[PDB]
Amino acid sequence: DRPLLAVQEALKKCFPVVEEQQGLWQSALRDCQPLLSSLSNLAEQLQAAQNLRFEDVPALRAFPDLKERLRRKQLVAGDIVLDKLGERLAILLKVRDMVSSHVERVFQIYEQHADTVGIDAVLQPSAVSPSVADMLEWLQDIERHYRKSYLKRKYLLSSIQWGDLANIQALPKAWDRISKDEHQDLVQDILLNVSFFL
Amino acid sequence: SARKIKDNAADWHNLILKWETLNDAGFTTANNIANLKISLLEELEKLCEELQATLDGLTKIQVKMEKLSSTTKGICELENYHPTTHFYEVSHKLLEMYRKELLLKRTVAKELAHTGDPDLTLSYLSMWLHQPYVESDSRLHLESMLLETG
Amino acid sequence: TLTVTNLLEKVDDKIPKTFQNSLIHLGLNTMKSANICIGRPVLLTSLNGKQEVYTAWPMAGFPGGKVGLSEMAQKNVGVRPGDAIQVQPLVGAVLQAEEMDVALSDKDMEINEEELTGCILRKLDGKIVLPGNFLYCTFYGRPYKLQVLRVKGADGMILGCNTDTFYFISSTTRVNF
């Protein structure tokens, strides 16, 4: 009995954290979209400033030392954006560590008690709450989802080099893809299925 | 006397701000011109004219800055009757920067009205927006000088 | 010739963060006591024998007689809170250093030295180097620590003093490894 109350408290103590953290994840993600768009734009500009020569065009000719004095501005105005992205990704990293720690706490409590609780008592659904087993399963699935998403985000974002001006001009699509490939809103449906707290 | 210097400072500030605002409007204009042109692969003239008007507002800004520079140099000379040179060289850096900038803007208007391949057009729109003749130390510089006074 | 405290938490984002990096934070009496010129470079010296220049700045609200130093700065000089320092309003001449020697942080294989040099320049503008000191770039989020071996001024004034010559960095300056 008391063990079942232990894991029950653990579970409906862990969930609200998952809810709020998901909200934070979401908001932090939404900031990244326009930033990335603007970065694609700067990439496009800087792309279309090597296709000239600037030594042979009538007007600009009277302007020595321009091509450089331009680039060395576009790059700064890009680098600032990219550091903003870095900040967002730091937010993401914070949230994955939070969730992972909490989920591991839950499993550890369970493993601490799962010898004096027949798995049949673990595995039986009630009228207002899914099966404990299914709850732990969903927790584990949330943790794995967050981890994979974060890490794929990073190994996309840290492969940006001024110098591959083609790849840098495809970010806004590869990103969106990396988002539209997990299962549709896991945390959303899990949160619902557990809304009736227990 | 130094009150004139403080006025020079605050005027520098407001002047740069007005500059940026005008540059924003003008960038909008030039965007419209590029798009209208490229849609045509005899009425854009009104656009080109009001862009020129933007340039004239710019020019007024430039001449006000030049007057400020001259006054500062004069106060320097007056104190040379027998730090303040700081202020003169500050305003001189600012002036030379913005003046070359204005020249570049004039050339980009000139060339932009009728351009060939689009890549020139993007490079020109850029050269307008990023105004690549302001090392941005200006801001620091201005603040650095501004805080020497109120 | 004053004491050192830690950097403050009153960042004034009226300047770009790039310059927020290279700075020291003082008080009003500090300015009007040792005759310091706002926005004009200033030399710091440790009793150990470290000399390093920075850009002074008085911050609104500060205990006078102290130098609020940056963490990276506090390491690069190697002094902690409560320690003393020797500050000097830089009065000598300055110049655009022509070419400067480099020492890699990790001495690993390499990264793209051209883009590397670009990143160093575009992020170290308006900074005065002195031999044996070190740099701090951010090559896409991860930091390095480049050391300066030798310096060549525009007039061949090679190096291996508060009234002397010193040299900053600019796009024309080139680098050697």
DSSP string over chain B = -HHHHHHHHHHHHHHHHHHHHHHHHHHHHHHHHHHHHHHT---THHHHHHHHHHHHHHHHHHHHHHHHHHHHHHHHHHHTT---HHHHHHHHHHHHHHHHHHHHHHHHHHHHTS-SSHHHHHHHHHHHHS-TT--SHHHHHHHHHHTT--
Half-sphere exposure of residue C116: CA atoms within 13 angstroms, side-chain side: 18
The experimental method, as deposited, was cryo-EM
> Closest partner residue to B139 among C15, C38, C126, by Cβ?
C15
Check if the beta carbon of residue C62 is closer than 8 Å to that of residue C27.
yes
Our CA-based measurement puts residue B17 at a distance from the nearest CA of chain A, in whole angstroms, of 19
Check if the beta carbon of residue A60 is closer than 8 Å to that of residue A54.
yes
> Closest partner residue to A70 among B111, B120, B130, by Cβ?
B130
C-beta contacts of C14-18 below 8 A and 24+ residues apart: C14/B139, C14/B143, C15/B139, C15/B140, C15/B143, C16/B136, C16/B139, C16/B140, C18/C123, C18/C125
| Chain C contact present for A55, CB below 8 A | no
Check if the beta carbon of residue B136 is closer than 8 Å to that of residue B7.
no
Q: Where in chain C does DSSP place strands (E)?
A: 3-6, 24-26, 41-45, 51-58, 66-69, 86-89, 93-96, 99-101, 128-129, 138-139, 142-143, 151-152, 165-168, 174-176
CA distance C124 to C127: 6
Which residues, in sequence order, are CB contacts of B139 under 8 Å at separation 6+?
C14, C15, C16
| Resolution of the experimental structure, in angstroms | 4.5
- Measured on CA atoms in the order A64, A68, A73, A78, is the torsion positive or negative? positive
Q: Sheet holding C93-96: strands in order across?
A: C93-96, C165-168, C128-129
Cα C39 to Cα A136, C25, C85, distances in angstroms: 60, 11, 20
Cβ contact, residue pair A161, C115, below 8 Å: yes
Q: Where in C27-126 does DSSP place strands (E)?
A: 41-45, 51-58, 66-69, 86-89, 93-96, 99-101
Check if the beta carbon of residue C175 is closer than 8 Å to that of residue C102.
yes
Return the residue of A nearest to B119 by Cα.
Answer: A48
Q: How many CB atoms lie within 10 A of CB A186?
A: 16
CA distance B50 to B84: 41
Chain A positions touching C115 (Cβ under 8 A) are: 161-163
DSSP string, B1-33: -HHHHHHHHHHHHHHHHHHHHHHHHHHHHHHHH
Which residues, in sequence order, are CB contacts of C103 under 8 Å at separation 6+?
C146, C147, C148, C149, C177
Neighbour subunits, A (≥3 Cβ pairs < 8 A): B, C
CA distance A110 to A121: 13
| Chain C contact present for A118, CB below 8 A | no
Q: If you count residue pairs, one on A and one on B, with CB atoms under 8 Å apart, how many are there?
A: 41
Neighbour subunits, C (≥3 Cβ pairs < 8 A): A, B
Count Cβ atoms within 10 A of the Cβ of residue C135 and give its class: 0-12 exposed, 13-18 middle, 19 or more buried: buried
Half-sphere exposure of residue B132: CA atoms within 13 angstroms, side-chain side: 21
| Chain C contact present for A65, CB below 8 A | no
Our CA-based measurement puts residue C15 at a distance from the nearest CA of chain B, in whole angstroms, of 6
Chain B positions touching A44 (Cβ under 8 A) are: 122
Q: What is the CA radius of gyration of chain A?
A: 25
> Closest partner residue to A158 among C121, C122, C140, by Cβ?
C140
Cβ contact, residue pair B132, A69, below 8 Å: yes
CA nearest C100: which of C171, C169, C22? C169
Asked whether residue B144 is marked as a ligand-binding residue, the answer is: yes
Query: How far from chain centre, in Å, is Cα B88?
Result: 19
Cβ contact, residue pair C122, A75, below 8 Å: yes
Half-sphere exposure of residue C81: CA atoms within 13 angstroms, side-chain side: 5
CA distance A164 to A170: 11
Our CA-based measurement puts residue B8 at a distance from the nearest CA of chain C, in whole angstroms, of 18
Interface test with C, best of A39, A67, A70, A79 (most C CBs within 10 A): A79
Residues comprising chain B, all counted:
150
Q: Is C88 helix (H, G, I), strand (E, B) or coil?
A: strand
Q: Is C21 helix (H, G, I), strand (E, B) or coil?
A: helix
CA nearest B48: which of B132, B114, B105? B114
Our CA-based measurement puts residue B2 at a distance from the nearest CA of chain A, in whole angstroms, of 36
CA distance C68 to C84: 11
CA distance C39 to C36: 9
Q: Apex CA A9: angle with CA A6 and CA A12, to 5°? A: 145
Q: If you count residue pairs, one on A and one on C, with CB atoms under 8 Å apart, how many are there?
A: 21
| Chain C contact present for B140, CB below 8 A | yes
3-state secondary structure chain A: CHHHHHHHHHHHHHHHHHHHHHHHHHHHHHHHHHHHHHHHHHHHHHHCCCCCCCCCCCCHHHCCCCHHHHHHHHHHHHHHHHHHHHHHHHHHHHHHHHHHHHHHHHHHHHHHHCCCCCHHHHCCCECCECCHHHHHHHHHHHHHHHHHHHHHHHHHHCCCCCCCCCHHHCHHHHHHHHHCCCCCCHHHHHHHHCCCCC
CA distance C121 to C104: 15
Check if the beta carbon of residue C30 is closer than 8 Å to that of residue C115.
no
Identify any residues that bridge with C93 across adjacent strands, giving them in sequence order: C165
CA distance B36 to A143: 52
Chain A positions touching C140 (Cβ under 8 A) are: 82, 158, 160-161
Cβ contact, residue pair A163, C171, below 8 Å: no
> Closest partner residue to B104 among A51, A63, A74, by Cβ?
A63
| Chain C contact present for A160, CB below 8 A | yes
Cβ contact, residue pair C140, A163, below 8 Å: no
Q: How many CB atoms lie within 10 A of CB A174?
A: 13
CA nearest C54: which of C45, C64, C62, C63? C45
